Design a protein around this nucleic acid. Structure first.
Lengths: 185, 47, 695
RNA sequence: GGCCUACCAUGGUUUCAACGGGUAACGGGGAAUAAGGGUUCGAUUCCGGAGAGGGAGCCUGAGAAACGGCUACCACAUCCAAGGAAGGCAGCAGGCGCGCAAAUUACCCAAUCCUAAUUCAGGGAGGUAGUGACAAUAAAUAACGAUACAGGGCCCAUUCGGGUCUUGUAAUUGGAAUGAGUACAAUGUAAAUACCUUAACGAGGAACAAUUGGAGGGCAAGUCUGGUGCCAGCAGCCGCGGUAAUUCCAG
RNA sequence: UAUCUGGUUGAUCCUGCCAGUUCAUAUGCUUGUCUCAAAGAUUAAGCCAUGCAUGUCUAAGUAUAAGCAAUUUAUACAGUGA
């Protein structure tokens, strides 16, 4: 007797298990955006898949039908918000287009690499999960954070950690504890 | 001390594993070392 | 589908299920639960009337403390705090139940192997802080091979841990680790502290209640061999025999205990084996009233006649034609003359003369009993009677296991209605001291070492030896290196092994089969699988599992694992021809095309002639035969190969040389020894080289 | 109100399926599945109904045909001094139901609310923690340089080549990083525990030791089977020695 | 039993047949961290050891506890209260 905690899964898996083209296609993405899973692609395909379904539906309704107008507009502004949908192609027949790579391009992972502070897609992973890089003063440790246009300017190292002032760090300090304890008193 | 201790073999209980890479251990490295390996092939298929 | 359904008498279509889904899904799940219930059919052979005390044996590492743990269990079942517990003790815990505790020694594998063959229920305590020591792990491995008792682990030292979060993680680890060794879903009880010298009553009450409903299963070895645990030890010798013969005598010994398993036959002269002393025999069998009687049992005795203060028993610790037949003074001539008032070598029994028989058998009317409206009815009845006789066996459950189980259950109470008629005098001899009859059986020729060096702290059991088991033949067993044990076992290297009731070291030999054409010996053991083996020793039944060890002396253990070899026995004979491969090497000293002269493989020209026609092969893989002894040198010979042999090439002739099994035998005699740890037998091949400093 | 009784009459339902039988049948909100139309499922968080070992009866009371009420019978079944007396887990937990199996006999009324004479007492309602990967979410097991040859690039090539832009396979190397864990403290909490914080600790393969399935070859003074030499086939935890012995297709 | 690749020919086609191609129960192996957290099943609404699950008082129905308390105006009572 307590309201159900609701849930749902966030990915879908390919019907054809061993399609060699889809496998190469998937791997290249993984090796481009620093993913670890086929699921990190499976996930996005699924996200796209519904977005496309919504849009297909809306399209069947008459031009300027209230729902279409209201719910289409919403979906477009949500997509433009995070930099997946270009400013020009802002009218849902192109959200009907829209590729997987457009989504992967906007992950905090990839955004850190674009800035170049990380210097690598994988260096970008390790940094993120390791409490450096932030958005506000707010540290973010999830690679899939999905950088919303107007925070892109605010990806930067955190006030904590090395790289962003604060302090060097136990593994370095431990060495400076062998510098002053071997060569001094 | 007198009290006898668990061996690392009988603690984890992994018997007769074939030898593995170091790079299955962190999936974000095997994604990195695949793409960096599969970008050398791309320079060889086309220019 | 229209006429197929109508073929049966009842409408097929009319009977159907409202839901296909629920019927189908539930049907598979119910069937899986059943199949699970089914287990292969066995025999109990323990009496419904008088059951023995189910022996429960606390085991574990010594520094944890199991003496104070058994004192906090007997003080909550009989409300009588004890002190300095030693030896086996019997306590009545219920209206029909009465378990018997038995503190093992932790230091002695000689008693740790000994106890697991008899412990009905084993309580294992593993230090919470130190997890599982080797002694726990070693005991679990030996117990499983012989026959798994019901295990109820416990975890002392739980109180010590500083943080509850770390303590919860440790409890899960031990609980998960325990599941793999035993059966998953079995949880060991945890005791917080021993501040008052006893555990908390609430934790102990749950532990006492959990043990009470154990309902232990029947072990295969225990329902074939009559065994018992010795309650109190007694020597019965004249001190004048001791003072004259001067402590050299083998002492007449009376021993006391509860029988178990199968009826130990009451004719004196069955041979029966003390674990750790040697093969003895019984001399006198007597039964006395059990000290601990269940309250329900006492009520029955009181009613027939028409003990509350003592609820525990710890003695070691301080407070007719047939009776005309079985006489031998009567002649069998006189036996029938006593009953009315010949050699068996001829097969046809003694008849009368055909003169006397033909006059007797004119009429067959004496023997006609044995052959095969009112009137009509009678006739019908007769017919019915004959029909039953003509077709009775052919004419006379849902699950096969339940049925074949009725082959046991109907076999049980047909003993019971048979034994009941006997019961006061005939049943006892036929009964032969049934399990739980607290018997006084006395011995003879027990050595002087056993009475002198005795302490009650170590147990002593009896194994009623089958007449199969009494001999000594070389056995064909198969075994492997126990995969905890690091080094591999060596051929012709002594190994203490517990086979049957006996513990002994013998000299095994590890013998593969070259694709089942012979028994070739190896030199070592195949380090991850069963190899077929052989060793001298006592004899047993086939399909008997044993579990052999290395050095059992506690002076020399180290941190390695002690149990090294486990396996069963395949068959037993008195002679196995056993083959070591030897090959005769030779070298060619003059080759040709397709014909060689090979030197220094055979010494004389006569030695070659014993071996001509032999299928010689080479390293390179070509075949041939050796044909004639070359004369003018004494050793060499001509041999035709299939192709041109080189000079660089080495011919080898395969051959087989039989070997033997060394007939060393050594029962461990552990508690005849004074110190009773550190019994040292035959050393390993590696150990002797170090002592003698050889390479 | 045929609910029951008395008098009186002969009606009532049915191929538009009555009546009877089955149901591994409580009904509904709903579930799973995705062109659509459908098919299958719903004991089970909410609504309704019914029941409390099986039947019946009934006391109290506004309300029960009540079972953590009584009475009787039936079936189980406990206690005894044998005269008698007592019980109803389809509440919470826990046990049996076979002979081989798996959630704690824990904490609290702090929340949510309910009851009483009532702010206060009580509440196994309910909340807290404990317990097998039911389902669902987030997502470590590594990241970067230098060097040693090797490259493909590319400018030149009369011809050595390596020298910069990095593709990376490397059996010596280089310092950085971080939580898994351990743990002052504060936070959390009814009190604890965990989380979120965070002093001190905590990573080089010989750990602080990723799995679970799959494809493919190779080895012996091995074995077995067939064969028109030396081959073909099955295969090989087994050889000759050796198990404190071997470093061994590095494993 | 639909959808896809694959097969009979020295080849090309079609009809033709054979070969592979979830979410529900069990079992096996494995199980580091955060948050979330449910929890039935032999057509047995079978049977139940023990403990707990229903009690309740305001200034304001009844106080001579031979109950506690003392002071505070209280010789009827007056606080607190089994």
């Amino acid at each position: 007797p307590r309201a159900p905690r609701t849930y749902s899964k966030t990915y879908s898996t390919p019907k054809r298990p061993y399609e060699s083209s889809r496998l190469d296609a998937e791997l290249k993405l993984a090796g481009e955006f620093g993913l670890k899973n086929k699921k990190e692609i499976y996930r996005i395909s699924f996200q796209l898949s519904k977005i496309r379904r919504a849009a297909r539906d809306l399209l069947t309704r008459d031009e300027k039908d209230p729902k279409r107008l209201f719910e289409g507009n919403a979906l477009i502004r949500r997509l433009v918000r995070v930099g997946v949908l270009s400013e020009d192609k802002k009218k849902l027949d192109y959200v009907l287009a829209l590729k997987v790579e457009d989504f992967l391009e906007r992950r905090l992972q990839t955004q850190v690499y674009k800035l170049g502070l990380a210097k690598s897609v994988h260096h970008a992973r390790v940094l993120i999960t390791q409490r450096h890089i932030a958005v506000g003063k707010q540290i973010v440790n999830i690679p899939s954070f999905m950088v919303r246009l107007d925070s892109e300017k605010h990806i930067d190292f955190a006030p904590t950690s090395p790289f962003g002032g604060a302090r060097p760090g136990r593994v370095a300090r431990r060495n400076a504890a062998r510098k002053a304890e071997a060569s001094g008193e | 001390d007198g009290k006898r201790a668990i061996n690392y073999q009988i603690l984890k209980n992994k018997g007769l594993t074939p030898k593995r890479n170091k790079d299955n251990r962190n999936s974000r490295v095997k994604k990195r070392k695949k793409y960096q390996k599969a970008q050398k092939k791309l320079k060889s298929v086309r220019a | 589908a229209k006429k197929k359904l109508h073929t049966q008498g009842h409408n097929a279509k009319a009977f159907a299920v409202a839901a296909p889904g629920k019927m189908a899904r539930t049907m598979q799940r119910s069937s899986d639960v059943n199949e699970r219930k089914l287990h292969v059919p066995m025999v109990d052979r323990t009496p419904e009337d008088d059951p023995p005390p189910f022996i429960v044996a606390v085991v574990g590492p010594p520094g944890t403390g199991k003496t104070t743990l058994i004192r906090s269990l007997v003080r909550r079942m009989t409300k009588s705090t004890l002190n300095d517990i030693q030896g086996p003790i019997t306590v009545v815990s219920g209206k029909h139940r009465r378990l018997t505790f038995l503190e093992c020694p932790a230091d002695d594998l000689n008693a740790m192997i000994d106890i697991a063959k008899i412990a009905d229920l084993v309580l294992l305590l593993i230090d919470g802080n130190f997890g599982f020591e080797m002694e726990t792990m070693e005991f679990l491995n030996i117990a499983q091979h012989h026959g798994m008792p019901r295990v109820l682990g416990v975890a002392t030292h739980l109180d010590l841990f500083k943080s509850q979060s770390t303590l919860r993680a440790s409890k899960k680890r031990l609980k998960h680790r325990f599941w793999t060794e035993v059966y998953q879903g079995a949880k060991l009880f945890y005791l917080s502290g021993v501040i008052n010298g006893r555990y908390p009553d609430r934790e102990i009450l749950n532990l006492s209640r959990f043990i009470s409903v154990m309902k232990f299963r029947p072990l295969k070895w225990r329902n074939e061999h009559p065994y018992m645990l010795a309650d109190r030890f007694t020597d019965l010798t004249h001190p004048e025999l001791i003072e004259t013969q001067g402590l050299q005598i083998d002492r007449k010994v009376a021993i006391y205990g509860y029988l178990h398993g199968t009826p130990l036959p009451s004719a004196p002269g069955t041979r029966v084996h003390i674990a750790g002393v040697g093969d003895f025999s019984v001399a006198q069998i007597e039964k006395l009233p059990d000290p601990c009687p269940t309250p329900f049992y006492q009520q029955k005795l009181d009613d027939f006649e028409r003990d509350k203060d003592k609820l525990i028993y710890a003695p070691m610790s301080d407070v007719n034609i047939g009776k005309l037949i079985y006489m031998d003074n009567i002649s069998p001539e006189e036996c029938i003359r006593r009953w009315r008032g010949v050699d068996l070598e001829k097969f046809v029994p003694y008849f009368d003369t055909f003169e006397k028989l033909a006059k007797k058998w004119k009429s067959v009317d004496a023997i006609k009993e044995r052959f095969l409206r009112e009137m009509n009815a009678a006739k019908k009845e007769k017919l019915r009677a004959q029909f039953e006789i003509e077709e009775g066996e052919n004419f006379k459950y849902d699950t096969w296991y339940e049925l074949q189980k009725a082959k046991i259950s109907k076999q049980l109470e047909i003993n019971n209605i048979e034994y009941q008629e006997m019961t006061p005098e005939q049943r006892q001899r036929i009964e032969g001291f049934k399990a739980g009859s607290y018997v006084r059986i006395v011995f003879e020729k027990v050595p002087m070492e056993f009475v002198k060096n005795f302490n009650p702290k170590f147990p002593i059991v009896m194994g009623g030896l089958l007449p199969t088991e009494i001999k000594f033949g070389i056995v064909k067993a198969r075994l492997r290196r126990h995969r905890w044990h690091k080094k591999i076992l060596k051929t012709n290297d002594p190994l203490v092994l517990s086979l049957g009731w006996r513990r002994f070291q013998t000299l095994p030999i590890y013998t593969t089969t070259d694709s089942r054409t012979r028994t070739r010996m190896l030199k070592y053991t195949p380090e991850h699988t069963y190899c077929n083996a052989a060793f001298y020793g006592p004899l047993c039944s086939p399909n008997t599992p044993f579990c052999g060890v290395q050095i059992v002396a506690n002076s020399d253990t180290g941190n390695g694992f002690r149990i090294a070899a486990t396996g069963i026995v395949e068959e037993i004979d008195v002679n196995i021809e056993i083959v070591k491969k030897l090959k005769l090497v030779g070298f060619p000293y003059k080759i040709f095309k397709n014909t060689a002269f090979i030197k220094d493989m055979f010494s004389s020209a006569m030695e070659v002639a014993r071996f001509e026609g032999a299928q010689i092969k080479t390293v390179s893989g070509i075949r041939g035969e050796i044909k004639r002894a070359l004369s003018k040198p004494e050793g060499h010979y001509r041999a035709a190969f299939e192709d041109k042999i080189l000079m660089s090439d080495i011919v080898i002739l395969r051959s087989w040389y039989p070997v033997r099994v060394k007939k060393f035998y050594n029962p461990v005699t552990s508690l005849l020894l004074k110190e009773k740890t550190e019994w040292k037998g035959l050393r390993l091949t590696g150990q002797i080289r170090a002592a003698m400093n050889l390479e």
